Amino acid sequence: SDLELHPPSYPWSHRGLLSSLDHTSIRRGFQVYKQVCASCHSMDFVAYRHLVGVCYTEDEAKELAAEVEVQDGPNEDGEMFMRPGKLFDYFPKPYPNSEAARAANNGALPPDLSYIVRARHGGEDYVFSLLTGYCEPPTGVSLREGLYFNPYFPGQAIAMAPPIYTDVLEFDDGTPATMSQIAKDVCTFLRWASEPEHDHRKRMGLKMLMMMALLVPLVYTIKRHKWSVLKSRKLAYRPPK
Amino acid sequence: VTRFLGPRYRELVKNWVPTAYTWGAVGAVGLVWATDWRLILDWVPYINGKF
Amino acid sequence: AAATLTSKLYSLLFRRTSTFALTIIVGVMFFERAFDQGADAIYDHINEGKLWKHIKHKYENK
Amino acid sequence: MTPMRKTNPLMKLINHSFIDLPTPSNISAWWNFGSLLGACLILQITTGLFLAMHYSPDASTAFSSIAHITRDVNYGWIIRYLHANGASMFFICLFLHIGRGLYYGSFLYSETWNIGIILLLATMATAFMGYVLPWGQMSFWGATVITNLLSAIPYIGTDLVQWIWGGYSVDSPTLTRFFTFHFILPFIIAALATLHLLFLHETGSNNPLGITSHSDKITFHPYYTIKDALGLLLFLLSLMTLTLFSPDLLGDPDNYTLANPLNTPPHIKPEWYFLFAYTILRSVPNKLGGVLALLLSILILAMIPILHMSKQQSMMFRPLSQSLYWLLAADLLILTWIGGQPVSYPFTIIGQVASVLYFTTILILMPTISLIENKMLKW
Amino acid sequence: MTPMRKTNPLMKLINHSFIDLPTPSNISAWWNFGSLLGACLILQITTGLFLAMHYSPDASTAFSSIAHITRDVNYGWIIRYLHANGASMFFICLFLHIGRGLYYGSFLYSETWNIGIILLLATMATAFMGYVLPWGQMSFWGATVITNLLSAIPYIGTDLVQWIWGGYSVDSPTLTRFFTFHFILPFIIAALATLHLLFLHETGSNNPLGITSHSDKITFHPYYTIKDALGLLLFLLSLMTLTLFSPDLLGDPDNYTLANPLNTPPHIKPEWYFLFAYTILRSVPNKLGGVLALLLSILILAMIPILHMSKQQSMMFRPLSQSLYWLLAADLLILTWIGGQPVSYPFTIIGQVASVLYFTTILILMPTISLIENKMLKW
Amino acid sequence: KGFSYLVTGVTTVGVAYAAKNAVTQFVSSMSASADVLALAKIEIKLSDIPEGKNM
Ligand SMILES: COC1=C(OC)C(=O)C(C/C=C(/C)CC/C=C(\C)CC/C=C(\C)CC/C=C(\C)CC/C=C(/C)CC/C=C(\C)CC/C=C(\C)CC/C=C(/C)CC/C=C(\C)CCC=C(C)C)=C(C)C1=O
Ligand SMILES: COC1=C(OC)C(=O)C(C/C=C(\C)CC/C=C(/C)CC/C=C(\C)CC/C=C(\C)CC/C=C(/C)CC/C=C(\C)CC/C=C(/C)CC/C=C(\C)CC/C=C(\C)CCC=C(C)C)=C(C)C1=O
Ligand SMILES: COC1=C(OC)C(=O)C(C/C=C(\C)CC/C=C(/C)CC/C=C(\C)CC/C=C(\C)CC/C=C(\C)CC/C=C(\C)CC/C=C(\C)CC/C=C(\C)CC/C=C(\C)CCC=C(C)C)=C(C)C1=O
Ligand code: HEC
Ligand code: HEM
Ligand code: HEM
Ligand code: HEM
Ligand code: HEM
């Protein structure tokens, strides 16, 4: 109803024009996603690869993929079976179809997270504020029993129950688990999942800037050199008298 | 053909030989650089960024 | 009294256009390596610890 | 013994158009965008051709295809962003290319000016069908709204809409034909551009002063080549900065969500370059009124040469006309800004005032002040 | 007031190119196949354009889309057959176009003759990639064989075959990539066709006698517009008979089966218009040597003007050259027939003999007989 | 003269550098998508297959 509360601009480590993404944050962010997120949210456009050079090594990724189970093509002279899974299978979807997901979530459909950051205004800033700020409704508003108040949601009513609290997980790194900490990591991981060319894009930008700095004055100098003959030309008018 | 034989044509080609050598070198070095052909770029003095 | 650097660079190289092209392409060969390496070092120095290549140490070789 | 570029037929054309073209010496930067437009076209063409090798023009796999380009195709993301960002640059140069003629009086070249109007309409169509290809929420619904705008025809109406759609709604058949039309039109624009240059050469370019430049003409190869090579470098600098630092600034989210025929976003605003006309439509409550307004808008450009009354080409020497020009530009800025805002009381009234002010200034104020200036000069 | 067609820029080109350029009065029907080729090109674009509105370039949906076009889409079947059969008519006209030049000495126009060779190579590329679009059993294997035949290139072959494939096999990426090339290439051919005419126009057309016809030139419009219209009517007659009565005679069945990667058909053969070359490569024992033969051949067409040593342009007054020309035509017929037959001792030797006979005729026999004919007349 | 030609000579170097890079991007896009490589050549296989058996 009322104009939605605009999230504030947070100091992300990659807000800078030339900064990059802390890859340890992405590692812990994915760790959060593996169980807390994948219950009903899905990442349709991500594979167990794309992580070999980002967070996890070759062997660790393969071992991690072995922990899942996919369904394989029809056995010759047979039927479908179940395969362990290799480094070309996308992340498991939680439900066979959208309608089944709606049934298990009071009719609400959890959007795919692959492009959520670029899909919503504010990007990760919006998500971080959304994950936190799960306060109670003010005086004078009521909500359906299966909905929760959130001032950052455009309708202030959301079917998402608070998903993250303290001590839900235990990072192997030893970093203490804190609602703010988990939110920061997962938001960074999502920003990557929607833009894995972030670091490369900015590196090329850096080279472009230095190359332009060298070139623009040089090309202007050549232009002035050729045009000098015209810019210094002097004229005179000498009629017969 | 038959007419091109003659002493002065020999003089002309001898004049232009060095220019052809330079252009041939330009083409050769440019091709390897554009294609980053490793085998010849592995014998260069310091350009060994490849592993 | 020594002849200026540019004058020597002109007579030996720039006077003949074929040599002018040859020196250009060799300079490209050399400047490409130099510029690329310098820019990469700057970018890494801006983001120590963030880039995963600096993180491999904590977990590698099992 | 004589030069070989004055005998070979293919070199005669290049010599006429490029090397020995007599061109005024005092032309400013405003005369560079012409070249840039073609350059941008040449870029778009090549950029798009490479995107076509991995795009599936189907309603069920188009969105997934783009996701695959930006995550699996080597340097696919940069190619996609260059295409998207290069389209906005096209319009920016195109608007500045048209403004120069309006200010300096280049419209007096009837033939060339009319060819441009056609080129503008062709480019506008190309950009609209390109923007629907990604098959995002904005793409799907933007096509629906703009395509339902032909129902205002008195007696035919639905027939054209259903004919274009290839069905009762917007679906795969519409996507496929738009893909083909998107592919082909740019090459048609290239042919039109050659006709544009053809009629231009008979007379030559117009200098900023508006006086005959036949006494101060210079060749094009040594001077304007480097001058137009510096402009293209700046053009690339701007384009690369936009792509490599703010890839999604002149766009809009909800294009990264799959199109849903059932759900509809609230604002559903079109692309920035198609915003001034959008406000003109909403300003008139009637559908037929709005569509006529949109068309009457472009038609004004064709009528502008007929509305000229001053005895001079350039407005450089006519300051009152200059002030009116800049007020008209500000009005266009207001129209664009309003297009980006939701429908509400202040915006609606402001849009109506801007629309009427737009038309009145062109159709009434400009001729009147031109006559007034002729009076103070004792012409 | 003088006619406007001699003052308007756009009308000057049309007047020069079509209405009023002098032409020989005696040119026979052989000189009518050039105009038909362009007409066919025009016909091939429009039909293909409509097919592009429904075709889906994917490994799985490509075959399905063709079936959908043939049955569900209105008049889809007729459009597809016009496109398919128009291709064959295009090559028939193209061969007759080339044949006329070889017989009447038109190759003396070097600039025009060389451009023609490029048009032929481009045409073949367009036709070869188009044959892959149906994605039938023959299309898949035809592309496989004609592409694997670049692994013979000294050191880059293997690297330049996977790059073309976009992978380590022939799959959907090849299909989409070929689709874009199929679309774009014909338009380049159209542009090149304008360079062909341009270089021709600066000298004028040839006549059967081989003597200059400046004494008896005629305006092109009335006489030859109706004559070319008659030719177009006859060309349409042939095309419609092929499509409306026996559409599939000139095609090869087994293309109506889904492409099976793990099933090599017993008898793989190219299309009828490409068979002559297939036999020239299948005969040479060396794989690389066969590629060098298929190329050295096509290019002897570029060498014809050098090997010319007669003192008469036209072979009309050269009875011995006529006998060789028809003998060479018969040799091409033999090569075509062998191309469609399985490998075996009789066909192989016949193909080998035909190949050597083809080459030696063009190189030695024709120059020698021309010299003897010159000696006979006491030049 | 040497100074002026030096400017031109240096400028071309920059133009050349970018040129090569740009082309290598467009050409590389046609080589092979990452998924093609992932699905191909990935055929690690255990040696545990008994004698005569064919897995
Ligand atoms: C049995 O299986 C097989 C088949 O069946 C299934 C087949 O189908 C085929 C056939 C192959 C088919 C598809 C594949 C082959 C494809 C190719 C060779 C070509 C590769 C390219 C393509 C897609 C791209 C095509 C290229 C295009 C558009 C680029 C050209 C663009 C332009 C504007 C053209 C511009 C040209 C201009 C300005 C130049 C102007 C001048 C000229 C013509 C003048 C000539 C100049 C000269 C020097 C020549 C004159 C020479 C003189 C005097 C010397 C004489 C010469 C001698 C040689 C003696 C094979 C091999 C096969 O196995
Ligand atoms: C013997 O002597 C002779 C000579 O020697 C003296 C000669 O020299 C010659 C000349 C030589 C020859 C012809 C030979 C070839 C040589 C040539 C120069 C010509 C070369 C050929 C070409 C470039 C090809 C020309 C074209 C072809 C096939 C046409 C392709 C391009 C097109 C425009 C064609 C049209 C396609 C059309 C319209 C599509 C059909 C669809 C239509 C109704 C539906 C379309 C709908 C839309 C766009 C909808 C858009 C909607 C939009 C934006 C939505 C808007 C919504 C709103 C609400 C506003 C001859 C003949 C001769 O005999
Ligand atoms: C201000 O003052 C000025 C003026 O006024 C005074 C002026 O007037 C002007 C006048 C000039 C202008 C504005 C300039 C612009 C003018 C115009 C009209 C604009 C025109 C624009 C164009 C034509 C667009 C140009 C670009 C186009 C079409 C696209 C170009 C690229 C391509 C087709 C693709 C090229 C190739 C690419 C990327 C390589 C990738 C592909 C491959 C290798 C191909 C893969 C293989 C295949 C097809 C296979 C082929 C072979 C096969 C199957 C088999 C072979 C055989 C076997 C045996 C295997 C100026 C400059 C000016 O300043
Ligand atoms: C684990 C952290 C977590 C993140 C990050 C996350 N989800 Fe969701 N999510 C939903 C549903 C249902 C919606 C749609 C409406 C809503 O939020 O209730 C949604 C919506 C969202 C939205 C915004 C929707 C919009 O339209 O703006 C984001 C962002 C999101 N999820 C991400 C079910 C879940 C469930 C299943 C219990 C879990 C667990 C869950 N969500 C946990 C998470
Ligand atoms: C859409 C693609 C277009 C291209 C590729 C193009 C191309 C060009 C070029 C290269 C020039 C020469 C520039 C100069 O000499 O100043 C030019 C001039 C001109 N253009 Fe366009 N143009 C396009 C669109 C338009 C449009 C939409 C108009 C609208 C009126 C237009 C009107 C003109 C006029 C009047 C001139 C002559 C200017 C003068 O004589 O000073 N053009 N065009
Ligand atoms: C003036 C010429 C052109 C203009 C103005 C133009 C404009 C556009 C625009 C604005 C988009 C959507 C960008 C986005 O959604 O981010 C687009 C998409 C596209 N265009 Fe064009 N385009 C032009 C020429 C071409 C050509 C010649 C081709 C030939 C293949 C082409 C192929 C495509 C493709 C494949 C897409 C899909 C974009 C995607 O998948 O992300 N375009 N075009
Ligand atoms: C592929 C599309 C082609 C088109 C649209 C085309 C068009 C034309 C036209 C309209 C003419 C004049 C009228 C006529 O001769 O009937 C002509 C003449 C000519 N063509 Fe083509 N041509 C094409 C390909 C070729 C090829 C492959 C060659 C190979 C040799 C060629 C060689 C010639 C020559 C030598 C002439 C001069 C005829 C003369 O002087 O009498 N053309 N062409
Ligand atoms: C000289 C110009 C052209 C030639 C020689 C040519 C030739 C061919 C050939 C031989 C086929 C095989 C069809 C079959 O075997 O059933 C084909 C298919 C096709 N071509 Fe064309 N083509 C030309 C122009 C075009 C153009 C301009 C387009 C689109 C703009 C196009 C689109 C298609 C499509 C969609 C198919 C698939 C039809 C099918 O699978 O039956 N073609 N082409």
Side-chain angles (χ1 to χ4, degrees):
Chain A
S1 163
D2 200 58
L3 196 148
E4 194 198 280
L5 164 63
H6 284 49
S9 161
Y10 279 102
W12 294 103
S13 299
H14 42 283
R15 194 141 62 105
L17 189 58
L18 274 292
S19 294
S20 84
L21 293 144
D22 171 11
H23 284 60
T24 286
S25 181
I26 302 169
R27 186 193 193 78
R28 286 173 293 115
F30 170 80
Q31 183 166 357
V32 175
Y33 169 83
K34 194 164 92 213
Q35 60 279 9
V36 184
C37 280
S39 295
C40 311
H41 277 294
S42 195
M43 291 215 189
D44 290 332
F45 305 82
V46 178
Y48 284 103
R49 48 172 190 111
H50 302 124
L51 315 182
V52 179
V54 168
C55 289
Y56 301 87
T57 60
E58 280 72 350
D59 289 344
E60 189 183 352
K62 304 204 160 67
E63 174 280 341
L64 186 55
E67 310 173 2
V68 72
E69 198 65 22
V70 299
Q71 64 93 34
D72 206 8
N75 179 63
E76 86 295 354
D77 189 359
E79 204 177 359
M80 303 313 165
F81 51 95
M82 286 317 275
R83 190 175 35 93
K86 314 300 171 283
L87 286 197
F88 54 78
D89 298 356
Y90 292 69
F91 291 179
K93 295 164 75 66
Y95 303 112
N97 56 344
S98 64
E99 197 165 2
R102 289 184 176 276
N105 303 57
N106 298 128
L109 175 79
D112 203 68
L113 270 60
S114 308
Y115 288 85
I116 189 64
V117 171
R118 289 170 75 88
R120 300 288 175 274
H121 286 84
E124 66 280 18
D125 302 328
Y126 174 80
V127 178
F128 184 83
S129 62
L130 183 64
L131 286 167
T132 68
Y134 262 93
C135 60
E136 73 291 354
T139 62
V141 62
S142 180
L143 294 170
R144 165 73 167 67
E145 294 87 6
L147 296 195
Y148 311 79
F149 186 76
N150 185 298
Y152 282 107
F153 197 69
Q156 288 87 68
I158 198 171
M160 187 141 55
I164 57 185
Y165 51 102
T166 57
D167 283 354
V168 307
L169 68 87
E170 169 53 7
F171 294 120
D172 47 0
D173 283 28
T175 310
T178 286
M179 186 180 76
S180 185
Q181 186 65 244
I182 293 86
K184 195 180 44 53
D185 315 320
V186 67
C187 290
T188 318
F189 166 65
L190 293 183
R191 172 59 172 179
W192 167 80
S194 178
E195 210 56 24
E197 67 274 54
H198 179 247
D199 310 344
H200 199 174
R201 184 169 61 76
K202 290 197 178 167
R203 158 177 283 115
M204 305 182 67
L206 185 159
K207 308 198 185 191
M208 184 268 262
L209 282 181
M210 304 191 300
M211 194 57 40
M212 297 275 137
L214 294 177
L215 270 173
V216 172
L218 287 170
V219 176
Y220 196 58
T221 312
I222 303 171
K223 192 265 187 187
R224 301 270 266 171
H225 170 77
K226 309 284 280 189
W227 272 85
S228 65
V229 62
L230 265 67
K231 295 287 174 63
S232 55
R233 177 184 64 181
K234 308 182 179 289
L235 304 179
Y237 180 54
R238 301 283 310 271
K241 318 204 172 180
Chain B
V1 305
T2 46
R3 82 218 182 89
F4 284 89
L5 276 298
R8 67 176 292 273
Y9 289 93
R10 297 179 177 85
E11 288 169 15
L12 293 164
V13 58
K14 287 177 180 177
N15 288 131
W16 283 100
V17 164
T19 302
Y21 277 13
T22 57
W23 285 114
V26 160
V29 64
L31 179 71
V32 54
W33 157 76
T35 51
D36 74 26
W37 177 282
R38 170 184 173 96
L39 165 69
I40 287 92
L41 294 171
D42 275 357
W43 307 319
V44 300
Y46 81 94
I47 281 168
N48 289 336
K50 302 178 295 302
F51 296 160
Chain C
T4 310
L5 275 298
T6 181
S7 65
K8 296 176 183 177
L9 262 53
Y10 166 80
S11 63
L12 313 185
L13 301 172
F14 299 165
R15 156 166 271 253
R16 178 168 292 100
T17 186
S18 66
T19 63
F20 179 69
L22 198 73
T23 184
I24 280 163
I25 210 163
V26 176
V28 161
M29 171 160 290
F30 277 23
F31 180 74
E32 173 164 11
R33 174 73 142 98
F35 182 87
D36 199 355
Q37 168 152 20
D40 283 332
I42 292 169
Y43 182 80
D44 297 336
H45 179 75
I46 293 165
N47 290 298
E48 298 97 344
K50 290 181 181 176
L51 274 178
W52 178 76
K53 67 183 185 174
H54 294 287
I55 299 312
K56 306 204 275 293
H57 294 304
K58 67 94 184 171
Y59 177 78
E60 201 84 9
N61 292 299
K62 304 299 183 183
Chain D
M1 271 190 234
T2 45
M4 183 174 281
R5 67 181 160 73
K6 295 191 193 181
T7 63
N8 184 254
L10 190 50
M11 302 173 78
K12 292 297 292 304
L13 294 181
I14 293 174
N15 190 34
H16 279 169
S17 65
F18 293 174
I19 294 90
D20 286 11
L21 179 73
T23 45
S25 66
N26 57 307
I27 79 177
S28 61
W30 296 123
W31 277 249
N32 288 10
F33 287 95
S35 57
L36 295 178
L37 280 169
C40 169
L41 186 65
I42 290 172
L43 175 74
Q44 288 291 117
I45 291 163
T46 62
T47 306
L49 286 168
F50 272 90
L51 289 159
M53 308 177 168
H54 304 81
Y55 176 65
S56 179
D58 181 296
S60 54
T61 70
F63 181 87
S64 55
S65 79
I66 289 161
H68 160 78
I69 288 175
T70 61
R71 306 174 93 106
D72 291 347
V73 171
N74 310 302
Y75 310 120
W77 55 270
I78 182 177
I79 292 170
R80 161 163 160 62
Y81 292 146
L82 279 164
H83 195 69
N85 290 116
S88 312
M89 299 289 325
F90 188 77
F91 282 99
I92 292 156
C93 299
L94 197 57
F95 297 150
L96 290 168
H97 187 41
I98 296 153
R100 171 216 62 189
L102 292 178
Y103 185 98
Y104 291 109
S106 307
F107 52 80
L108 293 198
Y109 293 147
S110 297
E111 285 84 358
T112 308
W113 179 266
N114 294 122
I115 301 281
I117 295 162
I118 292 159
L119 283 153
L120 180 58
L121 298 157
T123 52
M124 287 182 75
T126 306
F128 167 85
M129 295 180 308
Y131 185 68
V132 62
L133 295 186
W135 209 246
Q137 202 71 230
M138 219 55 56
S139 277
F140 172 75
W141 289 110
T144 306
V145 162
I146 300 309
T147 53
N148 265 300
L149 171 146
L150 290 94
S151 287
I153 303 297
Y155 186 52
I156 311 159
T158 185
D159 306 335
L160 270 292
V161 170
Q162 303 213 81
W163 184 61
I164 297 289
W165 287 345
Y168 310 149
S169 176
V170 176
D171 205 330
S172 298
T174 316
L175 187 57
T176 315
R177 49 161 55 68
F178 280 179
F179 177 58
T180 63
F181 284 121
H182 181 58
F183 196 113
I184 185 52
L185 294 176
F187 301 98
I188 315 312
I189 290 162
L192 276 156
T194 44
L195 270 289
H196 196 89
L197 270 51
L198 167 63
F199 292 116
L200 176 50
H201 296 152
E202 286 78 5
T203 75
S205 296
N206 176 41
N207 52 348
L209 293 188
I211 295 97
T212 45
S213 44
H214 282 307
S215 44
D216 192 317
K217 300 271 219 175
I218 56 164
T219 52
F220 187 100
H221 169 275
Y223 300 101
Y224 289 114
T225 45
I226 179 60
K227 192 190 177 190
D228 287 330
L230 172 64
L232 178 157
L233 170 53
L234 300 175
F235 173 86
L236 291 188
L237 163 59
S238 58
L239 173 58
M240 299 289 326
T241 42
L242 194 56
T243 59
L244 291 180
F245 285 123
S246 291
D248 55 357
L249 173 78
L250 272 284
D252 168 20
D254 313 328
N255 278 115
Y256 296 82
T257 61
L258 198 56
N260 209 346
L262 313 179
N263 194 330
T264 297
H267 293 94
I268 196 69
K269 65 202 221 192
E271 269 293 8
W272 75 266
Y273 53 92
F274 291 155
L275 271 185
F276 73 109
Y278 186 58
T279 59
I280 294 170
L281 188 138
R282 285 183 300 172
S283 291
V284 167
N286 191 341
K287 278 192 47 176
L288 198 44
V291 298
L292 265 291
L294 269 54
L295 297 161
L296 266 70
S297 309
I298 293 90
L299 268 292
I300 206 65
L301 309 176
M303 297 151 48
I304 281 167
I306 311 162
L307 301 165
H308 192 63
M309 303 279 314
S310 175
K311 293 194 178 175
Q312 301 173 340
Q313 283 183 335
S314 179
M315 301 190 321
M316 157 189 269
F317 297 149
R318 293 187 289 108
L320 303 173
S321 313
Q322 293 177 233
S323 43
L324 213 56
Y325 186 94
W326 293 112
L327 176 62
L328 186 56
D331 180 331
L332 291 151
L333 273 300
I334 294 183
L335 290 168
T336 304
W337 162 56
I338 283 285
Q341 285 332 300
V343 170
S344 293
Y345 177 85
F347 303 133
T348 45
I349 178 61
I350 295 162
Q352 285 161 356
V353 178
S355 310
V356 72
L357 182 66
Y358 172 83
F359 280 110
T360 56
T361 49
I362 309 169
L363 281 88
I364 283 289
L365 298 178
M366 284 176 188
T368 56
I369 287 175
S370 296
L371 294 172
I372 286 175
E373 299 172 300
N374 301 130
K375 182 66 184 293
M376 286 193 294
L377 279 172
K378 289 193 286 188
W379 267 127
Chain E
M1 173 266 283
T2 68
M4 64 95 77
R5 67 184 153 79
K6 299 181 187 169
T7 56
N8 177 249
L10 182 50
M11 294 288 300
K12 276 180 204 176
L13 281 295
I14 296 170
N15 185 33
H16 273 177
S17 63
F18 300 164
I19 303 322
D20 272 0
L21 57 81
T23 58
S25 61
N26 59 338
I27 45 174
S28 52
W30 302 127
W31 271 259
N32 200 358
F33 287 89
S35 73
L36 291 182
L37 269 170
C40 206
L41 185 70
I42 294 174
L43 200 73
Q44 279 291 144
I45 291 163
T46 77
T47 66
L49 199 44
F50 286 95
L51 294 171
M53 306 192 181
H54 301 285
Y55 178 74
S56 62
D58 174 88
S60 63
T61 62
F63 192 67
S64 297
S65 64
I66 295 303
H68 170 65
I69 281 173
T70 287
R71 313 162 151 272
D72 283 308
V73 181
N74 291 337
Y75 303 124
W77 53 273
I78 183 172
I79 301 170
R80 184 178 179 276
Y81 291 134
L82 296 151
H83 188 70
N85 292 131
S88 293
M89 300 278 315
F90 190 84
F91 276 96
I92 291 176
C93 295
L94 188 62
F95 291 154
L96 283 150
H97 198 38
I98 295 156
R100 178 180 65 84
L102 296 160
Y103 185 95
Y104 293 101
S106 304
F107 60 84
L108 291 196
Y109 291 157
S110 50
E111 69 294 12
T112 302
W113 176 270
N114 294 117
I115 294 152
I117 291 157
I118 298 157
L119 288 160
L120 165 61
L121 292 158
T123 285
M124 288 192 305
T126 312
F128 170 86
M129 291 175 289
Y131 185 75
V132 185
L133 295 177
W135 193 252
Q137 185 71 342
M138 301 286 114
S139 293
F140 172 81
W141 292 106
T144 301
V145 160
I146 305 306
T147 299
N148 280 336
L149 261 65
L150 281 191
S151 182
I153 302 303
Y155 189 70
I156 297 293
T158 183
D159 308 301
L160 206 66
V161 65
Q162 299 173 341
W163 181 78
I164 298 282
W165 282 346
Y168 294 105
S169 185
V170 172
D171 291 346
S172 59
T174 49
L175 188 48
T176 316
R177 169 177 326 176
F178 286 5
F179 175 50
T180 72
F181 288 132
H182 190 51
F183 199 117
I184 186 55
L185 193 45
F187 293 96
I188 308 310
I189 290 169
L192 271 55
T194 63
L195 273 187
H196 207 294
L197 296 185
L198 162 73
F199 272 103
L200 171 72
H201 275 176
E202 63 84 12
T203 305
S205 189
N206 288 127
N207 57 342
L209 292 178
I211 296 99
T212 61
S213 60
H214 295 324
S215 59
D216 194 318
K217 295 293 230 290
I218 285 286
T219 56
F220 178 85
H221 173 60
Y223 304 106
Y224 289 110
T225 48
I226 190 60
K227 201 181 150 57
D228 294 335
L230 179 68
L232 176 48
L233 188 70
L234 296 175
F235 166 93
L236 289 166
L237 206 166
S238 298
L239 177 64
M240 298 309 301
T241 56
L242 287 170
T243 68
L244 286 178
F245 294 105
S246 48
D248 42 10
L249 67 86
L250 195 56
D252 176 0
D254 206 357
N255 208 4
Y256 293 103
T257 45
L258 183 66
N260 188 358
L262 71 158
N263 195 6
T264 317
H267 50 90
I268 295 160
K269 54 186 58 49
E271 268 288 2
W272 79 264
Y273 51 98
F274 287 151
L275 293 183
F276 86 92
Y278 190 33
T279 177
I280 291 166
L281 73 85
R282 208 172 55 231
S283 62
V284 178
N286 205 0
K287 286 308 307 180
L288 180 53
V291 174
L292 272 300
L294 190 153
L295 269 285
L296 286 200
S297 62
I298 295 294
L299 279 290
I300 66 175
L301 199 67
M303 200 168 189
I304 296 304
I306 313 310
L307 268 62
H308 188 73
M309 290 173 180
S310 167
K311 295 192 45 161
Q312 282 170 352
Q313 185 180 13
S314 185
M315 272 172 27
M316 152 171 280
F317 307 129
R318 292 202 265 135
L320 296 92
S321 302
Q322 299 170 9
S323 305
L324 284 150
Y325 183 79
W326 297 117
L327 187 47
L328 172 78
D331 202 359
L332 289 157
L333 289 180
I334 287 149
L335 292 161
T336 317
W337 162 52
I338 297 309
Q341 304 302 52
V343 179
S344 294
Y345 74 84
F347 297 129
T348 48
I349 55 184
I350 296 159
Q352 273 157 355
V353 178
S355 315
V356 291
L357 199 151
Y358 169 72
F359 277 116
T360 180
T361 309
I362 305 281
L363 278 72
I364 298 90
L365 260 62
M366 283 181 76
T368 55
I369 285 281
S370 53
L371 292 179
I372 296 162
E373 272 184 349
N374 287 357
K375 195 67 42 161
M376 202 95 87
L377 280 179
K378 326 202 287 293
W379 283 113
Chain F
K1 292 157 62 181
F3 177 79
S4 61
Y5 292 148
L6 179 62
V7 173
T8 303
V10 175
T11 300
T12 307
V13 169
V15 176
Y17 170 72
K20 160 154 153 182
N21 292 117
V23 177
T24 53
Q25 303 287 92
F26 277 133
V27 174
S28 179
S29 66
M30 290 176 65
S31 64
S33 80
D35 72 0
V36 174
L37 283 73
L39 69 80
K41 181 182 306 319
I42 175 166
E43 200 63 15
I44 60 169
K45 288 175 293 193
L46 286 166
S47 86
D48 68 20
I49 185 66
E51 290 68 23
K53 190 174 170 291
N54 199 5
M55 187 171 178

